[PDB]
Every structure is written in structure tokens, then in C-alpha cells.
Amino acid sequence: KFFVGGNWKMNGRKQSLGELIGTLNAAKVPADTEVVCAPPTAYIDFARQKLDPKIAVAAQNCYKVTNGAFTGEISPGMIKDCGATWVVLGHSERRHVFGESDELIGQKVAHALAEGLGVIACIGEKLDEREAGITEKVVFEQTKVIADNVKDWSKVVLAYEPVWAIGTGKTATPQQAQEVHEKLAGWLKSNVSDAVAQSTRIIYGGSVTGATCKELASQPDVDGFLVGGASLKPEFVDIINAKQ
Amino acid sequence: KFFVGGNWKMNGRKQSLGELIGTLNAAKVPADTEVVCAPPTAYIDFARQKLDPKIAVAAQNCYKVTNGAFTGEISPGMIKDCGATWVVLGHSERRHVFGESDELIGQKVAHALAEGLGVIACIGEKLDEREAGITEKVVFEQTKVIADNVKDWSKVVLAYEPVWAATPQQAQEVHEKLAGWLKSNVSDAVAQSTRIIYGGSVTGATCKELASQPDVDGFLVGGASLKPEFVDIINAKQ
Ligand SMILES: [Br-]
Ligand code: NA
Ligand code: NA
Ligand code: NA
Ligand code: NA
């Protein structure tokens, strides 16, 4: 199933997000497409209440124990208690703005999965890493740490973020995304199963719009999207329709 | 006003927090006491709906702009939109588990206050800082960073977290130094009106003798805030 995730990031209030959710509830979700929305943490509850059950909800981050002295964090069990079924982990903003290490992200992955959430596990290389020629190394290491903490890939989606194209002056073509997605899909096929490679969705977390979504979705190993800014707009419906 | 804050940290679910809120709604709060509860961030909305208006709600953290590409963060705008009126900033767990720098905490304070939220600004020295004798230096620089980003102390509460642990006298000793720092570096008026609450281990047994200290103006309660004895702590001055 084609996977379309909307990452609202740190945006919206009850009013604007209620309007957005109204637009999404009205949209026909294709039968072959699974749609997930990641609202700001203070609105997970609100969003799950207002969104139609056909759209799943995701938390944007979580910590690695079920309860503890971690002022300002939330646990997978709280996410589940609010009706959310996924959590985004390892987002480039968590890694580079807030310094989340690979080890911490892997431990969060293991805990989210053990508590029965699905996980959208994000990876990607920065500009200087790409230009130094070690896209391979960075992306494989980050995927290794995630895989070390994944026992059932049924509940996991891997999101490649071309961090090197975020505000840097360079952008990623569809072919470049397909290049990296194929190299990742070889890893999974190589280090897990052939069935897991056919099963596991590798989604693209770069810049995607209504105008570009169809060409990118046509790439053989692009199996979905983790959408940023467009996720707050009616244009997100076009990206839901990428495969139609 | 005697200030009693309860930091639930990363604990509770809708059902168990509903029971906790029921016990708090039923308890009668003394005249001259402001009670604030800080739920896990996924339950700010839920907590505000179930708590009687007499109890204010606080977020446990926020970021430093109103909206942006900061997956996993919330802004003071969203805190207000959820009916909360406070945010805890600089808590020892944020600084020492999640490595939040003083600069970032100062920026957070500046933005939260500009947006109309109250701030519970937390400070405190680790045990190695204490054992090296530099307790005063640590909390003085931490407070200085907050003070440089405060334009209205009306809205601010200072919370001293003895991360190192603590007897009531040691607490009052630190609180008195902080009050003196405010008097000398900000203004006499701010030093006299700003409430410095104690954020170390507070229990229904230790609450009254801590509250009686002249510069201990309240508490920011941890574990005990999830238990019935929080009511006793709310009554520490009776
Ligand atoms: Br606390
Ligand atoms: Na990783
Ligand atoms: Na292999
Ligand atoms: Na495809
Ligand atoms: Na007192």
C-alpha cells in the first residue's frame, strides 16, 4: 500500500488545524493508499478526535520508557492512549537541531515497536556528507541502528530525508531519490529477507508538491512520502492522489 | 501568593490522570494559594478540560518561535490555545538529560513571556558543582540568563532545583542568596515581589517546615504531585 504521511511539524492552532482536518475528512482516500497525519504533540488528542478514522494519527517524537522523570517527553503508551497508531522517529530536525543520537533513536524505535506503535523511521545525509562522497556510509549506518532495534518490519516505514537539499542551494531530482531508495532497498533485501524488501515501504521525505508527486511516486523504489509544508494545505490531497 | 506547582513529568494516562484530577477538583484550595499542574504534553488539552478553573495548567516545555520546522516541539501559542497559562522552562531534566543550554532557555523565556504565558524558570547546581563550592556561581549565572530575557517579572516564578540532593535551612540559604541577587542586579521591587519556589524533594511531611522559611515562597513538586498528599502540600501554609 502507498504510504502518504503528513508531518505538520510545529504549526497550526485548533482553528487552522480544524479547517485542515475538515478538508482531509472530505477527501476520498484511494483504496490502495494509507494516509497518516503527524500533528504537534499538544494536538495529538484533538486531531484524533476530529479526523475521520480512515486517516491514522502519528506523534512527531516519543521517549524510550513507558513512564519516568522526563519533564517534557511523552511515551508510546500515551500516544496509544490518545488513539494514535504511529510515531515519527529520527526526524532530521530531531537529529540536527536537538542532537538526538543514533543510539537514542534506536532505543526509541525498540520501545515504540514493543509497545505496539508503528514507526516512521527517518534517515538521511547532510550536504557536507553528500559532497564528501559518504552518502552511502551515513545512510547505511543510520539504517543499521534502526534495524538492530527492529524485530518485525511489518510495522515499520523507512523515510529517506535528503537533508542536503533543505535550504542549502541544491535540490534532489526524482532520479537522485530513486538512486538512494534503491541502495536502501538493497540493504533490507540483503540483510533481512527478500520478502521484507518487497514488504517494506521506503518513503521519500524530501520536497514534494502537487506538481511533482506523480513523477516521484512513479520511481520503482519510492513507495510513499513523508510530506512537510504541503501537508498543511489542500495540496496534500493531490499528494494522496499521487498514484491515481 | 503561596505558589504550589505540581510537575507530573512523563507519567499518567487519561484514566489515571482523570482520577488524579478528580481528587484535586474535590480538594478545597486555601485562600492565598495559586495551584498549577503541569501534565505530559499530550494531555495539556485533556487536563485543562477536566480541571476546575481554580487550578491553572502549565506545559512542561516549549520552543522559542511561534511556528516552524521543529518536528516534535510545541510553541507558547499552542500552549495558550490549549487553555494553559504557564510553561516550565529550564527544568533540570531538560538541561541535564536533553542538554538544553542556558542560551536556549533564555530565548524560550523571552518568547514565552512575549506571548503572554507565565514562566516557571528552573535553576540548580549538580552535586559536583556543590562539592566544588560553586553553588552560588552556577545558580547566579543561570538566573542572570533568565533575568536578561525577562521584561515583566509579574509573570515569572523562579524555581530552585537542588539537583545535587536537602534540609530546610540549606534551601532557605539558597533562596535568600537568589533574593539578594535579584535585589542587586534587577531591582528592589522585583526582589520583593518575585516568588522563589523550592523544587527539591517535597512531601506532605516536609512541606510545612519548608514553607515556613521566609524566602521559600512555594514548591514545584515532583513525584508527590501524582499522589493524594499533594493536597497536604497545597495546604503547607495552614
Ligand atoms: Br519537579
Ligand atoms: Na538511526
Ligand atoms: Na548483507
Ligand atoms: Na513507486
Ligand atoms: Na515562606
From Swiss-Prot, chain A:
A Pfam match: TIM
The entry's keywords: Acetylation, Cytoplasm, Disease variant, Gluconeogenesis, Glycolysis, Hereditary hemolytic anemia, Isomerase, Isopeptide bond, Lyase, Methylation, Nitration, Phosphoprotein, Ubl conjugation
Pathway: Carbohydrate degradation; glycolysis; D-glyceraldehyde 3-phosphate from glycerone phosphate: step 1/1; Carbohydrate biosynthesis; gluconeogenesis
Record PTM Phosphothreonine, positions in chain: T168, T209
Keyword match Phosphoprotein: yes
Catalytic site: H91, E161
Record field: catalytic activity: D-glyceraldehyde 3-phosphate = dihydroxyacetone phosphate; dihydroxyacetone phosphate = methylglyoxal + phosphate
GO annotation (BP), single: methylglyoxal biosynthetic process
Cross-link (Glycyl lysine isopeptide (Lys-Gly) (interchain with G-Cter in SUMO1)): K137
Modification sites for 3'-nitrotyrosine: Y63, Y204
Annotated SUPFAM superfamilies: Triosephosphate isomerase (TIM)
EC code(s) of this entry: 5.3.1.1, 4.2.3.3
InterPro entries, per database record: Aldolase_TIM (IPR013785), TIM_sf (IPR035990), TrioseP_Isoase_bac/euk (IPR022896), Triosephosphate_isomerase (IPR000652), Triosephosphate_isomerase_AS (IPR020861)
Residues that bear Phosphoserine: S16, S75, S101, S154, S193, S207, S218
Subcellular location: Cytoplasm
GO molecular function, one term: triose-phosphate isomerase activity
Residue list for modification N6-methyllysine: K189
Function: Triosephosphate isomerase is an extremely efficient metabolic enzyme that catalyzes the interconversion between dihydroxyacetone phosphate (DHAP) and D-glyceraldehyde-3-phosphate (G3P) in glycolysis and gluconeogenesis. It is also responsible for the non-negligible production of methylglyoxal a reactive cytotoxic side-product that modifies and can alter proteins, DNA and lipids.
Family under the similarity heading: Belongs to the triosephosphate isomerase family.
Disease: Triosephosphate isomerase deficiency: An autosomal recessive multisystem disorder characterized by congenital hemolytic anemia, progressive neuromuscular dysfunction, susceptibility to bacterial infection, and cardiomyopathy.
Listed NCBIfam families: tim
Name the record gives this protein: Triosephosphate isomerase
Taxonomic source organism: Homo sapiens (Human)
Name of the gene this protein is made from: TPI1
Swiss-Prot record, chain B:
Residues recorded with modification Phosphothreonine: T203
InterPro entries assigned: Aldolase_TIM, TIM_sf, TrioseP_Isoase_bac/euk, Triosephosphate_isomerase, Triosephosphate_isomerase_AS
Pathway annotation: Carbohydrate degradation; glycolysis; D-glyceraldehyde 3-phosphate from glycerone phosphate: step 1/1; Carbohydrate biosynthesis; gluconeogenesis
Annotated residues for binding of substrate: N7, K9
Keywords, alphabetical: Acetylation, Cytoplasm, Disease variant, Gluconeogenesis, Glycolysis, Hereditary hemolytic anemia, Isomerase, Isopeptide bond, Lyase, Methylation, Nitration, Phosphoprotein, Ubl conjugation
A molecular-function term among this protein's GO annotations: ubiquitin protein ligase binding
Assembly behavior: Homodimer.
Name of the protein in question: Triosephosphate isomerase
Source organism of the structure: Homo sapiens
